[PDB]
Design a protein around this ligand. Structure first.
Ligand SMILES: [Zn+2]
Ligand SMILES: [Zn+2]
Lengths: 21, 30, 30, 21, 30, 21, 30, 21, 30, 21, 30, 21
């Protein structure tokens, strides 16, 4: 998931917006 | 903005700064 | 365990510590 | 909400577990 | 993205998240 | 300054990028 | 509650949330 | 100690209560 | 070095940074 | 205490070293 | 004071506690 | 730099003062 991708690889703030309510 | 390597509680901090009052769901893998 | 005032990012860090692998939901609008 | 119970008022670590999935 | 009140160390952690590898400057005297 | 715009008042993540080198 | 992997300053945060006003002692190994 | 166990292995909040005053 | 207001978890993170390997004690009741 | 000197009032990094073991 | 191993956002926290209001510049390598 | 030394090796608070304004 996003939690794993951010830590094993990298993620952007735009990807993280997919998880806002 | 730039790409970031976020692990542990540092990821929930980033979620809080991006979502703010909108709230968010933290769902790590099983 | 004790009771405290938890606000802002301090509150979600607490949620991360308590829930951990279970994940959690932060919904201030609720 | 969680904010009215933990931020405005005070809450225990047990009350925080109600917001865990 | 949303708007928020960012004060003290919470403000520089936000600067770290947004700037990242670009680096940043914190000048409260400005 | 950054403090008067983000701490006293509120600011967006975009306004924070003006302080990045 | 769940088991947690706490390192560095993340451990003192957890101590502060568990002990609160009771206070606590941080004593790492020699 | 508790400081080393939490970081090399894992620890619980109940173990951490042994260090409250 | 400078002087500041350090409250809550921000205060113990400061204690962790200053004491480090020496360890420290947080006793608000004192 | 440490709270009355560092939180209520202000303190220096040197004053924080008095609480180190 | 003691020597510290600071990485990521933990370094900007330490800068904020040392520099305070004087402000500081965070410039990581290219 | 200081950012890399602190993370690959170690740094002191006195070295970090070289970066205050
Ligand atoms: Zn960390
Ligand atoms: Zn705070």
């Amino acid at each position: 998931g996003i939690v794993e991708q951010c830590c094993t690889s990298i993620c952007s703030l735009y990807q993280l917006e997919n998880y806002c309510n | 903005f730039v790409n970031q390597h976020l692990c542990g509680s540092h990821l929930v901090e980033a979620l809080y700064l991006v979502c703010g009052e909108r709230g968010f769901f933290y769902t790590p893998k099983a």
